[PDB]
Design a protein around this ligand. Structure first.
Ligand SMILES: C[C@@H]1C[C@H](C)C[C@H](C)[C@@H](O)CC(=O)O[C@H]([C@@H]2CC[C@H]2C(=O)O)CCC/C=C(\C#N)[C@H](O)[C@@H](C)C1
Ligand SMILES: C[C@@H]1C[C@H](C)C[C@H](C)[C@@H](O)CC(=O)O[C@H]([C@@H]2CC[C@H]2C(=O)O)CCC/C=C(\C#N)[C@H](O)[C@@H](C)C1
Ligand SMILES: [Zn+2]
Ligand SMILES: [Zn+2]
Lengths: 403, 403
């Protein structure tokens, strides 16, 4: 089960030597892409996240401040503009630190959750590059939570909840591990201790088992790492919750508290769930075997007529399903058998096959078979649309069966 | 007047030393961004356009093939990756040419309209840079039509229609210009002749007033230039329709005709309407004077309660408007006058101010005032939401008046 082959055969995405580590998404794959993105966006609008758009290149002084030239230079594409150094952003964080520092901010605005889907480029060796799993270019579901030390606990709760929701939609399971302060660390030990206290507390509060790795954290902060398990029984590292006490210092971030102190530093929480959209597309592709849930599927409805007798009506049907914002196609080919068309639609992984006969044209109705050839028998166009939009909006895992 | 200042005061967008020629979009400005993108997308789905996702960086051989090295190299950021030259994409065209050549294609698949919102980088001199008007990083509403020479006529009709529709929503006028074959040109004269014939043909068919700039066309094709006029009386060059015969040659693109003849070349139509999203954001900012139409507005509804007595009933109201996918805020400050709150809300360019009193909490209603201060008096939450939804969907140029 390979996402590259399945990628080619469904005309989702392909690859080319002219841009190694970067992907070409054909319209269907692009649909899947934007579908994932807007899923995350809906959840954002539930959870109080605010999306921003940031520059893709920056002067060397920013990667100076952030710690990227000292630490990350190898992975970064750099070039010289007007005698000054510039680089493509490997991460969204420093830009967001700039957005936070744009104007004086008070305690009233915290927690401030800034989200970015912006394009990230990382330099990775040509022989290391494979498919969508290891890539140079990717879009990440990225967010930074700026908060007071004390809000952190609640924030983490939210974070965990967020994860659950998303993965509950995919049907994935997950494992949690707490990586605490290592021997090599930068910061004030008190800050570390309170932070880790809150992390542990919200972890227990969450109610699910976790392991404590004791010193496997980073030098700039403690972290909660999350492993997801798919239906094939594969384990993936996708989501992350990473605290940062360093970045607010390096960029000199401050906020007004309620007791008047304006010199207070915030805590930065780097958070991601899907990881990168690309790698998540790979994972989902292999996990589903190319057989997509209705809400995620670039091929949703396939309209078939019984004969040229009634194409006019298939056309009207398909159009009515198109304006309902479904991905819907039609097979008008006179040189094909009805059974052959249905079989091809089911091989093309169309979730629902709507067959139209004479009774179908006369009564203003459609007849329904499924990708797995279940015949849900005859329905009104209105009813079919309503039920399908229910199964879409709720992102049902098996739609065909539950219809 | 000036979009930079307005961008600062409304917390839409700002600029920074560390990335000249790029932009920082705060949540509000970002909302505007994605709103424009979504508008163009809806119209795409009406008009049979298919969106794709393409790589941001490419090997130098691509830019050599398309001809950007021998021409456009001065505007391109280039850098070395593993001994080889690479560059960020100034345009989406070559990538789309790659996507066309991915597999064999027939006449049945034409016209094939591929759309890209992808991020483009062009190198502009630091002294040339001003705001969002002249930039380095920008996202373009970009599309390439691949069509048979004949279909071109009909296609242009569509293009024209599309322009009209979009600008009908904005309220801009436009003047049309046909730029034809220059003295220095590359191609077969007969191809040029037929193409220009069809162009003039659809131009007259459209019913609008167009002008003939014989000779001022590109060396690689004839073009229709469009100038938009706003409400300040400024003319802008944003939208373009550009024929390309050269690109299919250089990338060796073919298609199976219904003859059985596969050696026929497609014509490429480069098309943009908004130009770049950034440019259009600037234009709209200065055109609206920072006062946005209801559908484009990051500040739509502000809920104001009179007394803390019902701070909470407004919590409820603002929540119900938030789940209707409106951009809605609330003013709970006990240290402010009702009047001061209202006029602050209108100075902030909030489209609708919902004042909430005791009677309103009792009868489950709201009382409506307007950014310009009109007053629509009590109305129930339901019909208020429905009316605002209609005014959002139809994209009313004035919601405030027509509510
Ligand atoms: C610039 C260095 C680079 C470090 C050393 C990178 C290491 C490889 C790990 O620390 C990476 C990591 O987990 O980053 C984390 C990313 C979130 C998912 C992961 C991701 O995007 O991969 C986030 C950390 C961002 C950190 C910073 C920033 N800015 C830090 O202040 C600076 C000091 C970090
Ligand atoms: C490499 C040259 C660049 C030309 C010489 C530069 C000129 C300034 C204009 O030709 C640019 C232009 O109007 O391009 C047009 C762009 C659409 C809006 C405009 C836009 O994006 O600005 C479209 C043309 C793309 C063209 C190609 C490609 N690929 C051509 O085959 C090659 C020859 C283009
Ligand atoms: Zn981060
Ligand atoms: Zn183009």
């Amino acid at each position: 089960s390979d996402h590259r082959k399945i990628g080619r055969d469904q005309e989702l995405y392909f690859f080319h030597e002219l841009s190694p580590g970067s992907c070409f998404f054909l319209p269907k794959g692009a649909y899947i892409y934007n579908a994932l993105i807007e899923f995350i966006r809906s959840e954002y609008r539930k959870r109080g996240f605010q999306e921003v758009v940031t520059p893709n290149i920056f002067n060397s002084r920013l990667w100076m401040t952030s710690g990227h030239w000292q630490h990350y230079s190898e992975n970064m594409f750099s070039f010289e503009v007007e005698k000054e150094l510039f680089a493509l952003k490997p991460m969204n964080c420093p830009g967001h630190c700039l957005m936070f520092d744009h104007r004086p901010r008070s305690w009233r605005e915290l927690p401030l959750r800034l989200a970015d889907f912006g394009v990230l480029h990382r330099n990775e060796l040509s022989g290391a590059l494979t498919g969508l799993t290891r890539v140079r270019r990717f879009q990440q579901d990225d967010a930074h939570i700026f908060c007071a030390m004390e809000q952190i606990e609640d924030e983490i709760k939210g974070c965990l909840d967020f994860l659950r929701t998303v993965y509950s939609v995919f049907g994935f399971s997950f494992k949690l591990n707490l990586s605490t302060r290592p021997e090599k660390f930068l910061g004030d030990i008190e800050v570390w201790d309170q932070a880790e206290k809150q992390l542990e507390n919200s972890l227990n509060e969450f109610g699910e088992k976790w392991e404590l790795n004791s010193g496997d954290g980073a030098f700039y902060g403690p972290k909660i790492d999350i492993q997801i398990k798919d239906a094939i029984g594969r384990y993936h590292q996708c989501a992350t919750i990473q605290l940062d006490f360093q970045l607010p210092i390096r960029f000199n971030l401050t906020y007004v508290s309620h007791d008047g102190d304006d010199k207070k530093r915030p805590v930065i929480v780097h958070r991601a769930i899907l990881g990168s959209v690309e790698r998540m597309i790979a994972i989902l592709t292999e996990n589903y075997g190319g057989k997509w849930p209705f809400w995620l599927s670039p091929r949703q409805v396939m309209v078939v007529p019984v004969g040229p007798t009634c194409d006019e009506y298939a056309q009207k049907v398909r159009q009515q399903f198109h304006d309902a914002k479904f991905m819907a196609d039609i097979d008008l080919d006179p040189g094909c058998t009805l059974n052959k068309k249905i079989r091809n639609a089911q091989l093309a992984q169309y979730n629902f096959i709507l067959v139209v006969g004479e009774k179908e044209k006369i009564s203003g109705t459609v007849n329904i078979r499924t990708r797995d050839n279940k015949v849900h028998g005859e329905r009104t166009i209105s009813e079919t649309i309503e039920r399908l939009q229910q199964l879409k909006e709720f992102r049902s895992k098996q739609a065909e069966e539950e219809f």
